[PDB]
Amino acid sequence: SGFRKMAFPSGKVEGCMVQVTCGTTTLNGLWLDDTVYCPRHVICTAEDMLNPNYEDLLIRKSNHSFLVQAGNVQLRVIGHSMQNCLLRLKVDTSNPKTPKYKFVRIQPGQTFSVLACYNGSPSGVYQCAMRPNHTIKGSFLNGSCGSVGFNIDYDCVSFCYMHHMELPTGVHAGTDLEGKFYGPFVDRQTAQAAGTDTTITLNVLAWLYAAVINGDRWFLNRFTTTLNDFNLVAMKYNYEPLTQDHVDILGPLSAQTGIAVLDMCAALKELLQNGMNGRTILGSTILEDEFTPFDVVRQCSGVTFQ
Amino acid sequence: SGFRKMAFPSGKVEGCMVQVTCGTTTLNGLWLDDTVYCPRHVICTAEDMLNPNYEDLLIRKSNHSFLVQAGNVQLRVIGHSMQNCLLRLKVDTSNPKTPKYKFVRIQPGQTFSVLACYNGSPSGVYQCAMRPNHTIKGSFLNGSCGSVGFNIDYDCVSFCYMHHMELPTGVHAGTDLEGKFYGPFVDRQTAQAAGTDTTITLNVLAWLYAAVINGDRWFLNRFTTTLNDFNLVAMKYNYEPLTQDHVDILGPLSAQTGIAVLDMCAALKELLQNGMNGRTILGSTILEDEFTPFDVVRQCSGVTFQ
Amino acid sequence: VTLX
Amino acid sequence: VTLX
């Protein structure tokens, strides 16, 4: 029993972390096989972050303009290319610690684990969700960019996130591992701001199933709702609309507890209208939206405390 | 000028079409390199479509239980495996007509081209959209299953759809090219029904841009709307909610016409409240939802009739 | 259903 | 913006 934000074990990612320096800028890269991956803004005059032209800035660099440091060993850079908002540095040594891995582009509402590093040395691991507005609520100081997010399926590390920047609200933005930003954001020092966010309804419902699986039923009710009438309420409380596909996804959790998904939505609807006051659900004073159904299945017993 | 449902040219797909027979069942397969892909229900006693067990049914078959016919040539099947709801038949000849291709899983609202075949010979090509409820509005007679949908990027054929069945409403269901159904549907003869559908709002808006690019402005107005107030109207008319990401996507069409996306949404909102009566938009008496933004860019001039 |  |  218990339910905690739980991160994947970070071992296989840690063995891939290196330091990349260009000029006076130092940040982290991700050494897989013979390639290190990092934010292209490693090349940038921190004065022309204002309006960088990267193609133009990159052509001015050779191979030996970059230093890759893996522990106390220097890696020789023997090629380089820009892929969207990342650099692909070809080093002379394949990484012996290279896990089986996929690059994956994660979808809003999904979670991943973040291995925060500084100077190519890992300092901490935490969990977070891709918000609907394409930001993460991370914890990042300067020199953290190139820090990565990941999930682990079996022994296979699916990388989904590499860190580029912080926004005026103190939330975070970056790219997939092909260098494609999450959200409408760019790797220039300009006025950009997180869009309005919504609560992830799929996740809230899943976490309400988690509560029941662990043995709490206090928030349930003798009521059901149509999909559509749930959504008039969702909209008013700034929750994402529920879809039939979201209903489908909650299939197993609902089979495991015996609460029909629209029964749970009815209970959600009431939580939003009457509050919780005084009471908690899995410890929480509030309704939690950063656990997917997959995360609930992963961590709870496949047997309900009935 | 003009705007037509326009399908991709079907040549490269046609050269991959074959006939697969098991027992008394004949349908179409897709021969790429040394593999033919078809609906696994090719193996089925049309009496135990009612409750098939495919693993159990497949183990009872050898390699030579299947005949693959390519034109007037027989292909020898030298291996076979079930991948979800498809069969992968290994033949002794690689297809010389094999285009460069990807297998792709398409997302609701997207369109693709359908090459309808019977007995491994192609009979017709049309366009359609993956509906929100995971059905297509196709035109299919018996012996059409294994017929494929596809898009073409350059000279690369991205296959997205292989046809399995028809529903009580006369709409269609199938799988990606890894055999994963679109929608909650199964390849058994049982009671299943298309879920409630919604109109694809992204597509409607895009097609309203197409109208302006071709030279029609009649439906525009001096009004704007918030994202959120558009959606209270969308919901009431059973349109999909508009997202900020959908706003982003309409970026270029809106740049090209000079109409801000929320300006267009305002004009949409009014079309839904006042009707059109008497007037048409690109020929159409009604609001069309089966052209994406990509399809509009593809087919219109990159110069507006101003 | 109608398997085509 | 703050590039970290």
Tab-separated table of C-alpha atoms in Angstrom, chain A residues 143 145 166 189, chain D:
chain	number	residue	atom	x	y	z
A	143	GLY	CA	23.513	24.555	-16.420
A	145	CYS	CA	19.840	22.185	-20.062
A	166	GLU	CA	12.614	28.384	-18.321
A	189	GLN	CA	15.772	34.929	-25.813
D	1	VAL	CA	12.852	33.837	-21.227
D	2	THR	CA	15.609	32.131	-19.130
D	3	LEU	CA	17.779	29.699	-21.134
D	4	UNK	CA	19.001	27.153	-18.538
